Structure formats: C-alpha cells, structure tokens
Amino acid sequence: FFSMHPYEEEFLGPILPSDWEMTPDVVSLFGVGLLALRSALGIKVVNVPAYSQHAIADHTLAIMLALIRRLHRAHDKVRLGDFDLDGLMGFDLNGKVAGVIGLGKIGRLVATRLKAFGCKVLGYDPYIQPEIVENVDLDTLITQADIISIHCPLTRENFHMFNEETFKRMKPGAILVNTARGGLIDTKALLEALKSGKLGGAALDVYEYERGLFFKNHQKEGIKDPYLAQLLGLANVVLTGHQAFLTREAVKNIEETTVENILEWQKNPQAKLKNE
Amino acid sequence: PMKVIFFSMHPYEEEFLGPILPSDWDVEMTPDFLDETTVEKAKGAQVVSLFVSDKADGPVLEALHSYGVGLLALRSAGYDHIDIETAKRLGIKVVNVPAYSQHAIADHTLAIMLALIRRLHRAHDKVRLGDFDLDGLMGFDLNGKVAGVIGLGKIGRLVATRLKAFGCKVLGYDPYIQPEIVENVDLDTLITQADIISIHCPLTRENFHMFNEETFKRMKPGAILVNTARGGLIDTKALLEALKSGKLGGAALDVYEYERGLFFKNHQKEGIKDPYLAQLLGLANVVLTGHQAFLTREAVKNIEETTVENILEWQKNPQAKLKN
Amino acid sequence: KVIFFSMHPYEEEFLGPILPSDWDVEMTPDFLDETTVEKAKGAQVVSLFVSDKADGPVLEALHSYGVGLLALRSAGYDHIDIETAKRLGIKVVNVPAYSQHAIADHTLAIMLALIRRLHRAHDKVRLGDFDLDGLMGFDLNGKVAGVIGLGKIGRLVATRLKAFGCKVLGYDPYIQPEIVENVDLDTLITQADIISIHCPLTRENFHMFNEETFKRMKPGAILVNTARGGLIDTKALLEALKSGKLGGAALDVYEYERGLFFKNHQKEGIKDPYLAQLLGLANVVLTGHQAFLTREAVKNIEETTVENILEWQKNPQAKLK
Amino acid sequence: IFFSMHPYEEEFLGPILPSDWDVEMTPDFVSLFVSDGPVLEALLALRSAGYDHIKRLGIKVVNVPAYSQHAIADHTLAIMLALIRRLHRAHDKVRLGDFDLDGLMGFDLNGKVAGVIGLGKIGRLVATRLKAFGCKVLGYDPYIQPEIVENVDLDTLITQADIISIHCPLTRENFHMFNEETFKRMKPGAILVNTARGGLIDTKALLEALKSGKLGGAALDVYEYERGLFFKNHQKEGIKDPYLAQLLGLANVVLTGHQAFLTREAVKNIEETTVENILEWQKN
Predict the structure, then answer these.
(1) Can you state the angle between helices B102-117 and A71-79, rounded to 10 degrees?
(2) Cβ contact A76–D95 (<8 Å)
C-alpha cells in the first residue's frame, strides 16, 4: 500500500488475512497487477464507492460555522487568557440566503443541514432540480446569497470560476465555502477580495496548489507557499488541509472496501469487480 | 439633561446601539468594568448600564445610590453580578434583557460541537506550523449517532432541529414539554445511550453538578458532552478526570462553573491562573469558548434595543416590565 | 490642558504617578487621526505616539484649537507633517535617547530565540509535542558575529556577543571601539555567521540587504534587525529565507511598519503580504518594534515628555526640530 | 546496537560512519539516552553525561564527558531573555494581528542583581553572559569561590537576587530546594531560571508563588515529573499533566522540553564521542 496513514492502519490491519512496510508517496495516493484506488494499458484498476458524503457535508458546515462564529480566532485568544469577545461576533444563519453550487449528493446533504439552521437555501446545477433547494440561475445565486458553498467537480471551464469578476458580482459581506476543489477558486483574487473587504469570509478545505503541501508535515521548514501564508493570516479565513473525508466511518469503509476489491480480483481476475 | 453612563462597553455593542438611540440624552461609555476603582465615573448619571463583567455589590450600590442613580440597565439576562437585595433596599430599579436570540445559541452549540468532532481546534494549531499531517484529526459522521438533548425550550428544540439534519437519532429529556422533533425518553436512557449530549436547561439546586463522577461512569464510552447552558451543571474536576482517562470522548463548553469573574475580560497581562481552565485548554478533546453563544449581530441588536427600551420606559413605576 | 493620544498602561504606570500637575490632563488609548482629533479641543499641548497620524489636515484642525505643542513620546517625527506644523506655528518636541541597554538586550533575546528555536518550541509544546526535532540550534561559541554600526547600541550588543564565546567583527567608518575587531563591510558580510544591524538609515543605506547582499553572505547565516526596517529589502529576505541561503532572520523592525506596528488589528488579521509569509517561516522570529519596551526606557520616555512640556514657553526647546 | 534514536543524532551519526558492522537504530525508551535489572547476556555507549543508571577506557563505562556547557548557558539566557522580554507572549499576539505592545514590557538587566547557584562550568559561563548584560552577579557554591561571581551565602542570594538561575546537581538534600519557604524569602518580583534539574523546584509552590504574584516569573527547561512527558510527541492526546498545563497557561512562565543541549556542536560531540568510545572497546 502506497501513501499509508496510521488512521488507515487502524481499520486496514485487523481485516487483512492470508498472504503478505507501506512507505507513503501498492494501493492509492489520493506489482501484482491491480491498482486499488481509494478515491471516488488496462493494468487492472479498481475504486472505492461511498467514500462517505456525510463526512464532507459535516465538515463543510463545521468549517463554515467555525468561520462565522470565529472559533479559529477565539481559540488563540483564550490560550492567551484574553476572554474579551471582541471580533468574535457572527450572525444568525437564520434568514440568510444560502447558495449551493453543485446539487449531487454532497450539495443536497449540505442543503439539508443549511435548511435546519434557518437559511433560505438557493442552489444551481445544470442537471437535477431537487426540492431541497430553490433552484435558480447561477448568476442569481452569486449575487443574492449571503453564503455560497461549492459542491461540484472541476472542469476545464470551471477553473477559476470564482475570480476577480465573480468576486465583484457577489453580495458584499458574503461567506464563500469550498470543500469541493481548489481550482474552482482564484486564490489571488480570493485574497484580494478578502483583503479589500468585498468578501466577508472564506472557509476552505481545498486549495489549488495543495498537492505537494497538504497531507504532509512541513514543520521543519514552515509555510513557503506565499498564498497559504496569507490565507492563514486573515481573521476571516478558516482553512483545513483536505480533511473533509477524515471520519472513522469513511475510513473504515474505504479500508473495508479496498480489501474486498482485492478479494474480488483474486477470486476471479476477469470480471467487472463492482467498482472497476 | 438626563445622563446615562455605560460600563463595560464593547465595540460590537456600540455599533448596534443605533446612534445612541437617545433614551436619555447625555451618554458616556467606558470599556472599563465597574468596581470600587471605577464607580466614581458614574457621578451625575441617573442610569448606569452594566454588563456581566461589572460588579455591583453593596459597597458599589451604596455609592451609586448617593450619586442619584435610580436605574440599573443590565445589558444581559443574568443578574448574578448585582446584589439585588441591597439595591432594592436603596431604591435602585434593576432591569435586564430577558430574551436573546435562540437561534444564536443553537447555532453556536452546533459550531462548538462540529469543531470538536472534526478536531478543528487541533488542525488550527497544526497548520499554523505547517503540519498538514492528518494524524490526530479524524472524527466521525454525525449520521446515525444518537444525540441526546436535555432541556427542550426553544434553544433545545432549535438544537435538535439542527442535529436531525446531520442524520442524528435525537433523544430528549424534559418533564414539562414533549416535542414532536424528538423521541422523548427518560434521563437515564439519554445518559446511557447517547453518543453526543447537549445541555439546554437552567440550573437548579437539584441540578447542581448533574454531570459528576457517577454520571460520567454511566455515559457511553467515548461520548461527547456539550454545555452552552450553565456551567454549574458540570462538575469540572470530574469532567477533567473523565477526559484524561479516556471514558469521555470529548467535551465542548461555552460555560464554566467559576466563570463569574474570569469570562468576558482580557487577562492578557497575566495568563490563565485558573487551575481547571488550564488543564481544559491543554487537552486535545476539549473545545472551549468564552460564553459567546449569544454573540451574534441579531442577538446584540436585541440586547441594545431592549436596554434602550428599558431606560426610555423607566419612570419610578414597577411596571418596568423587565424589572427584577 | 494636555491631551494624550495613544496612551498605554505601560506608559501611564510611569508618567501617571505624581505627573507634575501641568493643568488638566486627558488620556485616550485611541490613536489620533481625523476621526478623533476632536478630542483635542481645548487642549494647548497634544502628546502623541508613533501610532498617531498628524498630517496637514489634522494639524490645521489642531492649530485652530490653540494647540501649540506636539509632545512626541518617541524619537521619530516620521508621522508628523513637520513643515506644515512649522508653518502653522506648532512646536514639536521629542524624546531623543531611549535606553540603549534595552535595545541591546532585546537584540540578543530575539537572536537567541531564533537560534534556539523557541518560537517553534512555543507552538510545539502547546499541542503537547515535546519532540525536539526541528529545534536544534548551534553554540554561539566560536561563531563569527558581525555588528554594523558602533554607537552605544552597537557597542552594547558586541559586549554581549563576546560573552557567548563569539568572535565579534564590526563595521563603522566613524570610530573603532576596542570591544570589536574593526573590519571592512565586505569582510563582515562574507565572514559572519550572525549579523546584527545597529546603524541609522540613509538614502545610500536603503535596501542595504538586497538580493546581492544575500548572495554574498555566508550560507546558513543569521541576520538581525533592531535598527530600521528600511535597511532590508523584505522581498529579497523572504526569497533568501525560502531558498536556504539564509539560515534565519530575527527582526524587530520592518519596512512598511509605519501603520501596522503598535496597533491591535485583531478584528482583521494580517493583511500585509510580507508579514504573513514571514510569520509562517520557521527561521524568522519577529516582534512589534519592542526593543525599547522596558520599564527603565519607558520611565525615561515619560519623564522626558514631562520635562519637555514643562519646559515649553516660547523659545526654541532643547529637543525642538 | 542503537536505541532511542533521534534524527538530529542521525544527521551526525552516519556521516562519520558508525560502522562497517551492522547496527540498526530503532527509537524507543549499547546506546542509552536518558529517554535495568533484567539485562540478558551482554557484551555502554550512553550518549549522555548523566547518572540515570547505577582495558580502562578513556571515558570509562562509556559516557560523553565534555558535552557543550555553552549550549546550556546559551539556552539558559535565551529562555531567560525570552521571559523578561515576553517573547512567548508576543509570539501569540503577532500571529493574530495584535501588534499592541501591552504586557510585553520588560526590564533592563543592567543594574539587576543576578544570582547563580552552583558555580561549576555552566554556572560560570552563565555568570559570564549575565555579567555582560550589565548585571551584578552573585553566586553561591559550597566548594570554589570564583571571581566571576561575588560569592555570598545561599540565603543572601535567595533574598537579594532579582534573577536566580540554578546550575547545580540534584542531591537528596537538594530536592525541593525551591519550596514555599524559599519563595517567601526571595525578592518580590524575582525571576527564577532552572536548566539544571526539575527536582530542585517544588512545582506546586512555584505555581502558587507565580499565581500569587510573589514570583515575578519562571523560566524552565527542566521539570520534576518530566520523564514520560519530555522528548515525546503527545499530540494525539493533549497535556494530561495538571502542573504542566498550569505552567504553560501563565504569561510569566517560559518552558522548554529539556532542550538546552540541542545544538549542532553538542550533538556532533556526543555522536563522534560515542563512536570513538566503541572503537576503543573493540581494540580493548
């Protein structure tokens, strides 16, 4: 198994039997003949379903609630004995226009949560118009939504969807939430929107240019990435390193499925092995 | 020429007190909290408006009675910090803010909760060093977990409405209300079955230290306790012991017994002298906030508007509505 | 009446006591600009800090109140439109010499925190991470330390560095103290393991530490700046820092500090592009221009300010401009 | 044959080559850092200089004799200057955009009475630094009265020193030397520095002297009860030690995890010396 983490070995250890290091960076990365992908010529390839969407809709709200209630700020103030609540005032989500971009299973669940906090949940998707959301056009979402959260994949025209112009059309004070893909956001324009005060906040789980940075302990150096250092510096940014999947259920499932997938290709190397 | 001084003023407050919304006209504001060292700032004011960070004991009230103060406009629901009996012997009316935003408290409770389960407090500190390793940062899906709400007023109902949208099985206990949003069970069933417990009840003399050693022994191993209600409900020593031992998975706290002079104040010059607060903050399965569940624009607007209403209304008649 | 803008408790603890009763006194922690100049109405003396902005507009408003004295609680008149104040007729007075012992001590403090990697350990331990990896430094013993500028501050820093076992080189075209091996600047630049600047800023000094200067310094070297932020090109420092050519930087001053330092920006965070990148770097250490922030030096600033106001009548003062 | 290995040791142990034998070094608490009866058959490359254990080789039973005393006297002052100049506090403020210098005021060391307890090589080096900062340096030692220090009685150091730093070994009479009584006797506002031994201080009474405000500050690299805590990453749990959590939470405490030796010169010496000592026992 390639990029192995201890949070996988807790689940992936007791369920592996029969025949038989795991140095990170032969399974996944997010020579028998099978590559066991763990995301969501022929050189036999498989993949993991499920991958728990709940863990990502939960994180999405967690990160967005942390930002609006400024739990990142309070954390550092209370460590210092500074219990003055200045700069930690947020808003009630109740009555706020929540905007969901991408109405697959993660966007839907997020709209389910957002609905319960008392938001008016707008949403946009070229296919499916779910009941959970007042489906509207993208431009209307962009300009009317107090909160936008991105739950769509990254396509050639999706890149930098949030850029200097989208930031200009957005409601002043708006929170932008992204646990989908970092490429959907022009980090430079996001920092300029955040610094100038047009964008009220941002809560990111993903980051264009995250590749060699996330999932690794760079503690001996520090932050060499210029944009990451600026994101973490602003009070109105919350950021986590692509951990929106990291739940016991999701990992136990990723781990248990990966084992079955091998157990399927060795019980019969010629097949559809479910998640080919 | 009617003079009102505001003690323990904050920017998040003065920005929402309208202009001032002239209740009475002459207005002085200080960020400084009220005690014997500052009471004389109140000379000439008939109204003194306070926050929980202010101390109005006997000595301070005797000094306010002799400056002509007639009204104490408490910018809070709590009146713990006021010697009410002495102020009623002096003739000073006390008025409070009785209704915050219930949505603000519910929303903070969830925030505080997901912060703990997704280990956001640990990630915060990890990434500032460049440690983007995810070991130590795994949580669990609220989906399917059993969530137990204690106290089923609007706060508790709103908290249960949120949790149900995360996939939670929501249990609740409350002898005086049985809402449809919850499977009403018994308190012992909530204690023993719940993955996550959230408290949303007042404090009574039978309530005090409800979460004690025995209560922690009966809760499910690895359980999450969340307290935005009142810090008295939890025995902090026992909580610290249950947390260091592994029995309790985590705690998320907005309130703390012994907060009655620590919270709401910048103790930056010293640090954390409190023995229990220090051990709490260094623990990886604890999230903690300084009683900020109410700290939203919408709730602060309410508090200020109401305080303006309470002074505008005050005319020596015990129909002060929000009198105590 | 005397009004004090940008008052601090570490200041009022010292000038407050007795405060030789020159008329009625008012203090605000708030800093002076056009939104707050009103508080100076009725005052004849306005006392400032470097967090206060007194440009043309604000001086024309003060002049119209009868203010006749600017009591600057600092050495720098950088934040005062001096020519407009001299055209309006407002006298300006300052505190010329802090304590130099305080600057020298803070220089060494900030240096030893960088070299012993206390900033990293600080954050490590708070998480319960007592693993010493990433925390190794080196002995000051036998290292070559280069001091640039040899006034009392520079001399007092060499006096300290020599007690850590350091070989102390120094450059200064004026005076050659015995505490130091006087060398040429290029020898200091190329040979020093640790460099500490303690000179003023000239128009020929500006960005003295640029890319070229960083290319010429010894691989792995520690630079230290308690003097003036102008002397270092921050962009080049950041590049030298991210590449490994520069072992580290410890900084008390920063170009473009002139509106950021000395103010609580907690509500926002760090908007400055360079500050965020500096703080995220593990070989930095940075402080908010607090080299002077000792009781002894602060007592000096307040006493000298009291002396300056009491002295003010109408003749050119000891510390006029 | 190498136990309790750290990467800062591996940087140096390896280039010098331990080996053309096979050795292998796995870290876990014959290679014996500070971090037993039932020893099986044997054949002790301590890589230390301490008595954490009960041909005549040049360093005997094989420890590292020399070390770096500068590493510890440098760290001693670093820690001490960090606390007086409140660099821990500023570290956490500036991360927030909070550049207000309130609560970071220090004092000039110049003119302050510095007090050194134990006047061997670390204390002497420490007093040399301390002398250059402008301090009047006192010192106490039962043997030797160096001129670097105005030698005085222990009681006179305790009560007159603005700054105390401990540089003596821990003896069965020395345990809890800094207790409730010593803290009543010390000067109001004094800084206490300990890079020697944690047992020399009663942490509980230190926490009370600090909380009460009798003690102006404390700067520790060593801590009684540090054993299973220091040199280990406890990031998954938090800080379970009640006294450590309280120490870390005060603004007038600086603490570091026994890192006063961690310098390149010190570790290269410990590494080169260990190798030399094995090369001396194989040529017996």
Answers:
(1) 70
(2) yes
* Contact yes or no for D211/D236 (Cβ under 8 A): no
Rounded Cα distance, D215 and B270, in Å: 12
Yes or no: say if A236 and C269 are a contact pair by the CB < 8 Å rule. Answer: yes
Resolution value, angstrom units: 2.7
Q: For residues A21-31, b (16+ Cβ closer than 10 Å) or e, as one string? A: eeeeeebbeee
**Is C87 labeled as catalytic in the residue annotation?**
no
Token pair of D26 as six digits: 């796995």
Question: Which experimental technique did the depositors report for determining this structure?
Answer: X-ray
Query: Which residue shows structure tokens 């603004």?
Result: D251
Chain A CA closest to residue B162: A116
- D132 vs chain A: nearest CA distance in angstroms? 33
Those residues whose C-beta lies under 8 Å from the C-beta of residue B254, and which sit 6 or more positions away, are B108, B109, B112, B227, B228, B288, B289, B291, B292, B293
CA distance D80 to D107: 12
- At D113, is the secondary structure helix, strand, or coil? strand
Alpha helices (runs of H) in chain B, residue ranges in sequence order:
11-14, 58-65, 84-90, 102-117, 120-128, 154-164, 187-193, 213-218, 236-245, 275-281, 297-313
Q: What are phi and psi of A33, to 5 degrees?
A: 155, -10
Catalytic one of C289, C302, C303, C307: C289
Q: Which helix (H) or strand (E) holds B71?
A: strand B71-74
Smallest Cα distance from B210 to chain D, Å: 24
Tell me if A71 and B164 make a contact (CB, 8 A cut-off): no
CB contact under 8 A, D96 and A77: yes
Structure tokens at D161: 């020193």
Contact in structure between D131 and D159 (CB atoms under 8 Å) = no
- CA–CA separation, A249 vs D260, rounded Å? 44
Amino acid at B267: H
Task: Find the DSSP H helices in chain D.
Answer: 7-10, 69-84, 87-94, 121-132, 154-160, 180-185, 203-212, 242-249, 264-282
Residues recorded for chain A: 276
Q: Are D253 and B297 in contact, with CB atoms under 8 Å apart?
A: no
CA distance to C20, C30, C73, per residue, from C24 (Å) = 11, 19, 19
Which residue, chain included where needed, has tokens 């956490």? Answer: D92
Could you tell me which residues of chain A have a Cβ less than 8 Å from any Cβ in chain D? 73, 76-77, 79-81, 233, 235
Would you call C295 and D235 a contact, using CB atoms and an 8 Å cutoff? no
| A to C CB pairs, distance under 8 Å | 57
Q: How many CB atoms lie within 10 A of CB D186?
A: 24
